[PDB]
Design goal:
The chain is of the alpha/beta class. The chain has one domain (1-241). It is 45% helix and 18% strand. The protein has 11 helices and 7 strands. It has helices spanning 2-11, 15-21, 25-34, 49-62, 76-85, 100-112, 126-138, 155-164, 179-183, 185-190, 195-204, and strands at residues 66-70, 92-97, 119-123, 145-148, 173-176, 219-227, 230-239. The protein has a 7-stranded mixed β-sheet, sandwiched between helices. β2 (92-97), α6 and β3 (119-123) form a beta-alpha-beta unit. α3 packs antiparallel against α5. The N and C termini lie far apart (51 Å). S-adenosyl-L-methionine binds at residues 47, 69, 77, 97-98, 126, 149.
Length: 241
């Protein structure tokens, strides 16, 4: 709706502006950042300068070959992080977006930014796309980096899907947005739980995504909260006894 207005804006840009920004990720991000709706508001879910720079720093430091985003909206994150992923040989970025309308817009922006061969947008429920992605990757076991910024109540349910799919291993980094506002106490709690506390959590809390996505309790997590507005930075550092 409101999102279609932004797409229309991009599509009705002068040929000279499209030519100037095509294939240039930072320039495309700037067009998204500078757009204003009739009511004066901006495009939602643009990643801020400092936080973006923080997550980019992590990508540059750890050089994930496979980065997955739970969420995606209109392509901002996929363009910012996918651009860094494009610097890494073999790098792929997967954006798992449930709203099909949004994903169609993010696709156009990702394409305009020149990131189409690197960035795949998977449409549908995150847990379904994770199952599909794992199976596709099998035909290497774990994800290198996961960016989590969709609906707060699916943070733990989807993480448990990833764990159950064995896509978390030592070296895997989880970066979860909006921990404080509004934000996501349950996820913050889960990744700070010991392996035994999570053993019991999993037996007690049914996963809404499906019963057999129980999770994996024997993963050792080390979590740090960065404030700017806060993100949880969780590294899998080992397996429990």
């Amino acid at each position: 709706e409101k999102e279609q207005l932004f797409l229309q804006h991009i599509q009705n840009l002068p040929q000279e502006r499209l030519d100037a920004i095509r294939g240039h990720p930072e320039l495309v991000l700037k067009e998204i950042d500078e757009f204003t709706y009739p009511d004066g508001s901006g495009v939602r879910m643009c990643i801020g300068d400092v936080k973006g720079g923080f997550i980019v720093g992590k990508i540059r430091e750890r050089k994930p070959k496979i980065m997955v985003e739970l969420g995606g909206y209109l392509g901002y994150s996929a363009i910012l992080f996918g651009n860094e992923i494009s610097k890494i040989p073999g790098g792929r970025y997967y954006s798992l977006e449930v709203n099909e309308d949004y994903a169609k817009i993010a696709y156009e922006l990702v394409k305009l930014a020149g990131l189409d061969e690197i960035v795949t947008i998977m449409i549908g429920k995150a847990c379904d796309s994770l199952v599909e992605l794992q199976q596709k990757l099998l035909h290497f076991q774990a994800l290198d980096m996961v960016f989590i910024d969709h609906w707060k109540d699916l943070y733990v349910p989807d993480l448990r899907v990833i764990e159950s799919l064995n896509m978390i291993a030592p070296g895997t980094l989880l970066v979860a947005d909006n921990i404080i506002t509004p934000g996501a106490p349950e996820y913050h709690k889960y990744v700070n739980m010991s392996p035994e506390e999570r053993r019991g959590y999993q037996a007690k809390v049914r996963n809404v995504n499906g019963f057999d996505f129980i999770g994996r309790w024997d993963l050792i997590y080390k979590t740090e909260t960065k404030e700017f507005d806060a993100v949880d930075v969780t590294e899998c550092v080992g397996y429990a006894k």
